[PDB]
Structure formats: structure tokens, C-alpha cells
């Protein structure tokens, strides 16, 4: 059988289950690194956004995001509080006396000042409430709030 001799001369025993397994193993061992990198980027950006934190390339922005602050306490904003103008603290009403000790001595009875103080407080609330309501209603709109 010369056919058998020629076939044996130019033939190498190759197994599909070996070559396929090796190729798939290498491809998986690198695709796992690919997926790990993608998931790491996603986790870093999410942690920066929600305050959990970031590791790796984004670790340097942790200090900056902590300086920005969360909730309503912004350390970047609190710098302006040191220069905030000083304003008087509201106290009880004291009547003002004109010409004290003289025959023309009259004083503001301060009974109507309290009524004015009540209506002023009401107006200040209605203004602040409307401001906050419009502030929340126009968050997606690129407008000052």
C-alpha cells in the first residue's frame, strides 16, 4: 500500500479540541482584562458621581470632589461665608421716644409695629417659598437658581 505510505509521510495528527481550547483560553484570558477595565472605569466614574470614591486613574479627582462637597455643605462655597456682611439680629420691639422729658414727648406705641412685623414675615415666606419652588421646577433648564 504505497497510498498508506504517502499518506503517513505528509500527515500530522492534530486535535480540534486542543487547538480550539488553546485559542479560546488565550482569547478569554485577554477578554477578561478588557471587561475588567471597562467595569473599573464605570465604577470609578459612578463613585466620583455619588461620593463612593474612585481608584486608579480617577483617584486624583477624589480630593477635588471632596472639596466640592455633597448635600448642601460645599467647602468651595463656604469660603464666601467668611466675607459675608454682618447684619443685625432680630430682637423684640423697643418703642422710640421723641423729645424725652419735654412737654412734646410722644413715643411710637409699637403695637402696630408687631402687626407690620407679622405681615413682613408672611411676605418674606411667600417670596422664599416661590423662589424655592421655581428653583426646583427649573433645575433641568439652564437658568439661575
Amino acid at each position: 500500500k504505497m497510498a498508506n505510505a504517502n499518506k503517513g509521510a505528509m500527515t500530522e495528527n492534530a486535535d480540534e479540541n486542543a487547538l480550539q481550547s488553546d485559542a479560546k483560553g488565550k482569547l478569554d484570558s485577554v477578554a477578561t482584562d478588557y471587561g475588567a477595565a471597562i467595569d473599573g472605569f464605570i465604577g470609578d466614574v459612578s463613585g466620583l458621581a455619588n461620593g463612593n470614591g474612585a481608584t486608579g486613574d480617577f483617584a486624583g479627582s477624589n480630593s477635588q470632589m471632596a472639596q466640592v462637597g455633597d448635600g448642601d455643605n460645599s467647602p468651595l462655597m463656604n469660603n464666601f461665608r467668611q466675607y459675608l456682611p454682618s447684619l443685625p439680629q432680630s430682637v423684640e420691639c423697643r418703642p422710640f421716644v421723641f423729645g424725652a422729658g419735654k412737654p412734646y414727648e410722644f413715643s411710637i406705641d409699637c403695637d402696630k409695629i408687631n402687626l407690620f412685623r407679622g405681615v413682613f414675615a408672611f411676605l418674606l415666606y411667600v417670596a422664599t417659598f416661590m423662589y424655592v419652588f421655581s428653583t426646583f421646577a427649573n433645575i433641568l433648564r439652564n437658568k439661575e437658581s
Binding site: 500530522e12 488565550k26 486624583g60
Partner: protein, 109 residues
């Protein structure tokens, strides 16, 4: 039961695929580094602007004189300063909300 060179050809094809996909991984990591650099630059610019703005307010500072205090205390209701502080707190909350939303939007790069 195959001719010579077929296993070598298959190994070469696998090696080519592995090398190309590794190049793709390296480029992906480069892109992620670019995104991190962009975020860092944006936050640094905000911080620098804040530093400049805070400095200007020292020079022009002024205070209400001793007079006019009596009238202000005469009229001032109990909820004036709380309203002013609520407005300031709302301003700060909106600022940090905008910053965080921009950070979230950086997920599309």
C-alpha cells in the same frame, strides 16, 4: 490526520487575533486615561475660579455703621436671617448638583 502546516497556520491566526485584541485593550486604556485627565482639568478650573473670586471680596469689604441698627432691629422679623440663609443654602445645593450632574454626563465619553 491532516497535512503539515495546518496546525501552524491555525496557531498563527490565533496569535494574530490575540495581538490585535491586546492592541485594542491598550487603546481602550489610553482613552480611559484621557477621560480622567479631562475630568481633572475641569475640576481644577472650577477650583481656580473659586480661588480668584474669593480673593476679590477682601478689598471692598465694608460694614453697616453703628447707626441704622436701631431701625433695622425695630422692624426685623424673626425669619429674615433664616430666609437669607435658606437662599444661600439653595444656591450651594444647586451648584453641587450641577457639578455632580456634569460628572455623571462624563460617562458618555
Amino acid at each position: 490526520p491532516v497535512l503539515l502546516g495546518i496546525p501552524l497556520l491555525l496557531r498563527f491566526l490565533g496569535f494574530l487575533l490575540v495581538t490585535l485584541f491586546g492592541y485594542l485593550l491598550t487603546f481602550l486604556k489610553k482613552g480611559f486615561g484621557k477621560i480622567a485627565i479631562a475630568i481633572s482639568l475641569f475640576l481644577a478650573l472650577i477650583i481656580g475660579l473659586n480661588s480668584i473670586l474669593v480673593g476679590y471680596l477682601s478689598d471692598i469689604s465694608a460694614q453697616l455703621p453703628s447707626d441704622f441698627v436701631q431701625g433695622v432691629q425695630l422692624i426685623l422679623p424673626s425669619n429674615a436671617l433664616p430666609c437669607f440663609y435658606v437662599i444661600l443654602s439653595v444656591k450651594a445645593a444647586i451648584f453641587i448638583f450641577d457639578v455632580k450632574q456634569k460628572i455623571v454626563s462624563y460617562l458618555d465619553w
